Amino acid sequence: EDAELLVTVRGGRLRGIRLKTPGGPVSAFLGIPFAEPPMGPRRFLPPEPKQPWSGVVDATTFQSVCYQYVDTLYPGFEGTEMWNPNRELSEDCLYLNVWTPYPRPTSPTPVLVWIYGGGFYSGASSLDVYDGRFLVQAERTVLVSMNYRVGAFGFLALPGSREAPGNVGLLDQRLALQWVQENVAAFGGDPTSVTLFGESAGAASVGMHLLSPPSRGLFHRAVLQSGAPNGPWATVGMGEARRRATQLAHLVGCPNDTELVACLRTRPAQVLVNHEWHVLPQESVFRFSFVPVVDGDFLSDTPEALINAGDFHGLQVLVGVVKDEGSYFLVYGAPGFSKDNESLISRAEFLAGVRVGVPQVSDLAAEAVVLHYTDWLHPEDPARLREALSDVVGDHNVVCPVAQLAGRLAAQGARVYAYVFEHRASTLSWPLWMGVPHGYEIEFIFGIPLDPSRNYTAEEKIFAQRLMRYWANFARTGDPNEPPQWPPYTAGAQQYVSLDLRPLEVRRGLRAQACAFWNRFLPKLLSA
Amino acid sequence: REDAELLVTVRGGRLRGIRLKTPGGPVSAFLGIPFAEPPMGPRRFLPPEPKQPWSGVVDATTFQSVCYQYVDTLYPGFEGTEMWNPNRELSEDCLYLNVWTPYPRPTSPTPVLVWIYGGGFYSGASSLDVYDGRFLVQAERTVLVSMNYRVGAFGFLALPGSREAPGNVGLLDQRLALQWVQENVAAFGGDPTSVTLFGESAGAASVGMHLLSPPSRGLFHRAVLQSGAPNGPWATVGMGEARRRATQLAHLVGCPPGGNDTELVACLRTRPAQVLVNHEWHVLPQESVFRFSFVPVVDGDFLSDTPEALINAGDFHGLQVLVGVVKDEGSYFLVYGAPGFSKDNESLISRAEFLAGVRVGVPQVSDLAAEAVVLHYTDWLHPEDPARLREALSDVVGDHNVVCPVAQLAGRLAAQGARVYAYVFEHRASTLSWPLWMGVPHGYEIEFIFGIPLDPSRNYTAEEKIFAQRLMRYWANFARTGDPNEPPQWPPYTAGAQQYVSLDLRPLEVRRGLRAQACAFWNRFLPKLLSA
């Protein structure tokens, strides 16, 4: 036996596995139970701590993926299958993973905690693109990632009810963060230096832990990649959450809240998944059925309101976006779009796409979108319309929520660093018209290009090593700079850097003109 | 001993004119021809009546009186403002017109240009030096006509429905002059079947209203709209708001001691003309720039609908129009009420003064609408740069009142059968007395259209004289042919390509879009916003 792979947690003993990287070995502890399995009567309920076990838990392989919808838009296509579950689905899915250097560190080592995205309806810590071995070897951190419940299992809410209070998937995350505080030192990690990082709904999750006091004591720094808690998709009101939960029950043959949840608990998990998309109020892209609910407990107010009221002195945040946030989502419902065409849409398709990408707004609000995003010297140019609808979806859902979060946090005491990721991977299987699509900086942050079995260029590996150094520099010090400098983002100067194969370039404004529309004017329009 | 060239018989009787010297040769001028009975006493606020025939010879030898009007006092003695102020005595006896013709008189019928001055429907006169028609007639051998029309309350006070102050009588003054041209211009050598209206600011709005009023449209064949359009937010008023303004004016001068309309106007008619002028600005609903108290009223008679609706519903096949704007339409107006502005300094305003100026420049709109304006005209990478803010507020006022109304009319006329030519005038005269930050201000293309640089007593450069001769040729070519191009080309403006040309000392340059991004806000979105 190898003593470096034997660890005792508070719940008992674990057996890890030695992993190889091109830079040397890494210790991995995969599939550590941190909660009791949320099954049967535990479905929809907050997680409970895993009870202690005798013997040695096998922690040499990833555990099951939480039950979720499986994308079937392009079967067998690398660009979609890389996000699909790579382990069997199960409601017994509340496990987390710890990578550490080999041999295990003997001094407290900074901890990175990864929260995956997936629109709160999908995702897994076991995805190849989230493999922590390269970050841990290159930058000598401890990396933790957890599975959390998604879809109805994590976020179905009948607000005020106790059988389905909502946001339990966020409580799964919080329980994992409490687990890190209590046990990460046994792996060499420093519980006093925990940096949360996450992408899309993972970034939204990070922001929500920033705005929920019970979570704030469990970490010290935050990274939000291509997502924010204050967008139009990451939260839902109590009334609409109840309507969606009630329609799902009807769609699966179920009838007060007590009897409703009891009937839902009798249904196979896959039956809930098969009706998940049909509780949305309209055809759309970038909207998900079961998301965090604002009900006064986990979030005592809207994320917007909590961001505006917060004192954020002493917090450092790293936030950013990819160059083309909107393009990926257009093939999931915007008319005229496909990954196998040029998607050169007409004005009619553009106008129809605006209602799909900006759903549930008045005709006047939609007219305002069309005004801002039309070039009135080229109102019908297909290439310009394609780019414009990509901008609509990306600005509305990602760029402008991130810009507002960054500006408000900076103006209220936080040190913010902002980036735009502008390198299209040579490996990218999506068509050229999508540019740098949503999600495709993750493989570089995790050092995946260092994997020899993959086909990245020599320059891309150096680029990955640069990004891993920025991220780990930020985790260690709150400052990504290697001591061309990366300046903090401020509400006035609005400075950010471009991340690509070229050295850092400092620019001003995260789509400032467009985001003034989404963040300043449009909310006034919807009030009246 | 008389000169046969200076004697003309019109339908009302005989006239005697004068021979005008010009740098290029002699011109015949008949200045101060009565075309209506004097609208005095009981005739105040009433539609004009045709001038009754006279015996003997009327001396049409000098400009007649300016119609009674407010006199600008913002910068006393400043050439930039005094050039627009009355240069004849003020009088309600002011319905006279002017005819310039070549010397000797043309033998074959000659195209006619008819000028309608601007001045916000509250001021102006055909006698202003800058409207001297002698150079156009000499250079391009056309007949030039200009008329005085009543302004202010005398021309546009309206108690809608009443026959004692029906409104729009200043427009009826213009139409009667136009009827006079149809009936009499051939006696001067002019061709009544080739008449081109042209005007600037309120004169341009007037031209457009004659295009949209069937009884006027039969009296001309082509139109030129300089820096103005009938569909602007300042050029017309609704029936109720016109009544409110008339009733408030009467109240401020002691009438009645609202109520009965006949009683009210009878009391108004006893008030001295200057007393009404002294309270004219007090009836506006708020502090503003580019808003005028008494303007054409949309009451179903002269205008059967709003100019917007008439433009959208009209068939304009067989019409040629020439339209355009100056480069900085808004700047002149900011010193008349926008906080922080003055011709004397650089008017580098603050953000707070910019936001306050938006409400002055876009008066009587909801807070939401004002927010939309601020959104579109703020550079959110430089939201507080004083120079950018000054320029932005100029664009706000200029796009809202001139550029975008002109662009809407140009686009709809073109799409509905008219041949349209569009320009942007971008030469700042060497003699301009306004400060440099104002750029090319509203109204300062006129002197080049009328060829004023050819006047020996003024100091224009030689290139500006050549420029002035170029523009006169464009305008006269359009008057003769419907196309400013001489028999680099000036392409027609269409709703798609939206091409226009730049007028300056360099040869014509073709460009696209009359501030298309901005005017989409004003012409397409903002009306939708004001509807809920």
Ligand SMILES: *[C@@H]1O[C@H](CO[C@@H]2O[C@@H](C)[C@@H](O)[C@@H](O)[C@@H]2O)[C@@H](O[C@@H]2O[C@H](CO)[C@@H](O)[C@H](O)[C@H]2NC(C)=O)[C@H](O)[C@H]1NC(C)=O
């Ligand atoms: C680009 O493709 C889209 C989507 O079409 C799908 O993908 C291709 C395999 C193609 O062969 C289509 O049959 C597929 O439906 C096209 O938009 C579709 O057009 C069809 C036929 O008119 C219509 O039934 C679908 O509803 C449309 N789908 C969407 C999402 O709009 C689009 O026309 C193609 N672009 C081209 C050819 O330029």
Ligand SMILES: *[C@@H]1O[C@H](CO[C@@H]2O[C@@H](C)[C@@H](O)[C@@H](O)[C@@H]2O)[C@@H](O[C@@H]2O[C@H](CO)[C@@H](O)[C@H](O)[C@H]2NC(C)=O)[C@H](O)[C@H]1NC(C)=O
């Ligand atoms: C509104 O007022 C006019 C005012 O005319 C009055 O005529 C006399 C009756 C006298 O009161 C004068 O001082 C006024 O000037 C009315 O029009 C008059 O009506 C009278 C009688 O009906 C008739 O001879 C004429 O129509 C008008 N006389 C004039 C002009 O001398 C009008 O009827 C009033 N309307 C209402 C509803 O009261």
Ligand SMILES: *[C@@H]1O[C@H](CO[C@@H]2O[C@@H](C)[C@@H](O)[C@@H](O)[C@@H]2O)[C@@H](O[C@@H]2O[C@H](CO)[C@@H](O)[C@H](O)[C@H]2NC(C)=O)[C@H](O)[C@H]1NC(C)=O
């Ligand atoms: C630019 O001038 C404006 C306009 O008014 C000036 O006031 C005179 C006293 C004189 O200074 C001239 O240059 C101008 O005619 C200034 O704004 C004025 O400021 C004064 C004093 O605070 C105030 O009483 C007026 O109400 C202001 N007028 C307006 C229209 O707001 C402005 O301050 C000047 N800009 C500078 C000095 O940078």
Ligand SMILES: *[C@@H]1O[C@H](CO)[C@@H](O)[C@H](O)[C@H]1NC(C)=O
């Ligand atoms: C033209 O020049 C002379 C001075 O040389 C003088 O008349 C004046 O300054 C200028 N302009 C006018 C209108 O007189």
